[PDB]
Design a protein around this nucleic acid. Structure first.
Lengths: 95, 78, 97, 103, 97, 80, 105, 91
DNA sequence: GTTTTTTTCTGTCTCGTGCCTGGTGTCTTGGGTGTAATCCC
DNA sequence: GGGATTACACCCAAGACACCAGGCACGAGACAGAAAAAAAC
DNA sequence: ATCAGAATCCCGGTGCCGAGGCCGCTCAATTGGTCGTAGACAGCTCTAGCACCGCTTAAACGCACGTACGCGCTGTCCCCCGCGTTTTAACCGCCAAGG
């Protein structure tokens, strides 16, 4: 039996965080998995173009930041950059 | 053939579009544009399955062909 | 008795903006897709979920193109659609040359 | 897990694996997947938060995809993002040109 | 004199500008507008001229396409006078809101 | 300042003529200016962001090329 | 024939393309026939479009191809126009589109 | 930083051998060639990752050229590619 | 207005070379498919 | 009944080094070419 | 306006079914340890982006003025809405005669 992938449990937990009293359909969970897929793919393609228009092959978080604020529209993007940056601080401040 | 498209089907298409009043030649014009749409879609879908060396077109290949025409559709594992 | 026209159509517009269920039912749509699929390589089997995908994408596609065509006709100082309206909308999007 | 060590919810190393097998670069840094995972996390938080409000509207408990399409089509920046995006069982805006309303 | 009730002027200049090759908007005011928009997100930025020429090229092409579909909207409107909501309908259909 | 008003009516005329437009209404020009402005807003925002990660205070032609390829309004001619 | 270009009888450098594939982060490994195949496709595309370029430039008694020639030759094609639909050429312009409602009748 | 100029000259002399060209015409041509190369190559990389094949042979390139270019161009290109494969494989 | 038909003066382009850098010949070895058996849905 | 899994085959790319004539930058002189301006329709 | 009456909304009701809990696995994240060069950085050099101005001139601006498409209106004529009537695509229940 080949082991297949999903992101269902993760975003499921996130949904339980932001709304404890809320159910969901299974197809919509698949939709959100496809959503994460699509956003990830556009980001990664912008990362590869970041590489080739920078002639470098290392990926750091700075490239991810500039990729996100290339793709996403402004206000949403800056909030997301804030969330990611504070997470970078909280992780890399410890181990 | 193409005449399996009923008049009230394209009428329901106007209704979910929200369109009120309907002319005559609309029906055959609709069937034609739908045909060319499905032609390009299923052509490159069968191209995907040709590379797959397999005798059934995958739903995955349908999804990727929609991506290839810039028509990205979620929902069915894409 | 007889009702006055235009009313029932808009009432069912308000009805048909609600359920996202598929408008064209299955079997004839499947036959049409199979018949067009016949002329590339002979007799390919199909996933039914893929058929539902084709059906969904086709119906949403046509609904949106109807919306733009309807707004074209509203701009055209009229209420009823014309085939030339579809030609205008397609000429803006760029399917045909 | 680094996600817990980042205090977040998405698995880092799965993403670190997928970055490798995507031919995305030659080498992969340390905390870039953490940043990307947090981006994903806030995105899905915002989306499903509006979806939760959409369920609050209809007084539904389980999310139907119609809620998702509606919450996409309401917000501005999200709809400009997902302009070329459609969803099965989507539907559209309940919208009527009032010039076609009768008099 | 030879005042000429109209018709040859506009269409003749269309013939000239479609025999033409080069730009129409002249350089300096467009450049200064570019730098004013540029002075809004990061200050004090320098530029090479070829970037500005590409910007001018794609700008005029963008507006040419707007004018073409606007023209066909007007022809469908049974008019030759353009209107603003023509352009609004054209950008509505182009998905560039 | 006010270079948005540096857009001249005869330039709009010339663009209409190569655009093939015959008859010009008067309520068109500032609407044209606004659309052109929003266009160039998104363009130069993305180009400057590409140059932000470039760590060079000067934007190149290549940058604007890459940014407009990102919008899908992709233009040839200058390499990129 | 020492060079693979002479071994293919073509005009493009293949090992160029193979290094492009290697310095592409495209696949992990690249076979031997794919770069030759793709370069041949490229060479056909060049010759095919340059045919329409040659006729379109010859339309105006000019030995040199200008960008206006290239845009004309593209828009006068059907497959190339649906190819280059999102595509714009520098110094291009568009076709003569004089509507029939405009000529003095 | 190489452009494809004499390649264009040799194609041109093989087709319309009494024909000049401007500089920026060559620039647009090389822009074109790079765009086409990038689109095909990325689509082939999509073929790999959508098909879990750890490398790419010529068959992937054939089906990708099918996926990009429409009919007549596609069939003539497949013909030219297989003929090149044939003559390179023979020697 | 269109367009054609003379010089002219004229900008680019093709020839012309030298420097060089990537392109080429080939073994080992390995993994990457080639293909075939088989379950299996 | 054909696609999914696996397994044994085989076989030539990756590299790694050794040998190399082309590839392009720069010039030159020529050579296709835009216009000046008669000059018809 | 205004009543009658279609059309729709909306409230228990029950049922059934899949969302979600749950639980025992095992394989990739981890943990730790070992080379290594890509890049963060210091610093050199010459280009080009910038600013400025003088001179030239063609290009914009304002107005004079007719004028003619845009438009509001009109009559008209026709042909889609819709409701009714069969009616046939579709999926269920009976005659064939051959085995």
């Amino acid at each position: 039996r080949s082991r297949k992938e999903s992101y269902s449990i993760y975003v499921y937990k996130v949904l339980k965080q932001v709304h404890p009293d809320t159910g969901i359909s299974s197809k919509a969970m698949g939709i959100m998995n496809s959503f994460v897929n699509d956003i990830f793919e556009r980001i990664a393609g912008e990362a590869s173009r970041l590489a080739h228009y920078n002639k470098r092959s290392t990926i750091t978080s700075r490239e991810i930041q500039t990729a996100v604020r290339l793709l996403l529209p402004g206000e949403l993007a800056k909030h997301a950059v804030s969330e990611g940056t504070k997470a970078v601080t909280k992780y890399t401040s410890a181990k | 053939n193409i005449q399996g498209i009923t008049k009230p089907a394209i009428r329901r298409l106007a209704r979910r579009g929200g369109v009120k009043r309907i002319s005559g030649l609309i029906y055959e014009e609709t069937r034609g544009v739908l045909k060319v749409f499905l032609e390009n879609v299923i052509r490159d879908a069968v191209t995907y399955t040709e590379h797959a060396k397999r005798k059934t077109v995958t739903a995955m290949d349908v999804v990727y062909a929609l991506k290839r025409q810039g028509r990205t559709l979620y929902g069915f594992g894409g | 008795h007889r009702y006055r026209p235009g009313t029932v159509a808009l009432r069912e517009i308000r009805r048909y903006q609600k359920s996202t269920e598929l408008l064209i039912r299955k079997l004839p749509f499947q036959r049409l897709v199979r018949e067009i699929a016949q002329d590339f390589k002979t007799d390919l089997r199909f996933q039914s979920a893929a058929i539902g995908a084709l059906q969904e994408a086709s119906e949403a596609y046509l609904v949106g193109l109807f919306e733009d065509t309807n707004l074209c006709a509203i701009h055209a100082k009229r209420v009823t659609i014309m085939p030339k309206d579809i030609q205008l909308a397609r000429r803006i999007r760029g399917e045909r040359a | 897990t680094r996600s817990s060590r980042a205090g977040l919810q998405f698995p880092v190393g799965r993403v670190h694996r997928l970055l490798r097998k995507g031919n995305y670069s030659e080498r992969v840094g340390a905390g870039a997947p953490v940043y990307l995972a947090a981006v994903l996390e806030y995105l899905t938080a915002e989306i499903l938060e509006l979806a939760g409000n959409a369920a609050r509207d209809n007084k539904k408990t389980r999310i139907i995809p119609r809620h998702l399409q509606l919450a996409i089509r309401n917000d501005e920046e999200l709809n400009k993002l997902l302009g070329r995006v459609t969803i099965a069982q989507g539907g559209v805006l309940p919208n009527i040109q009032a010039v076609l309303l009768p008099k």
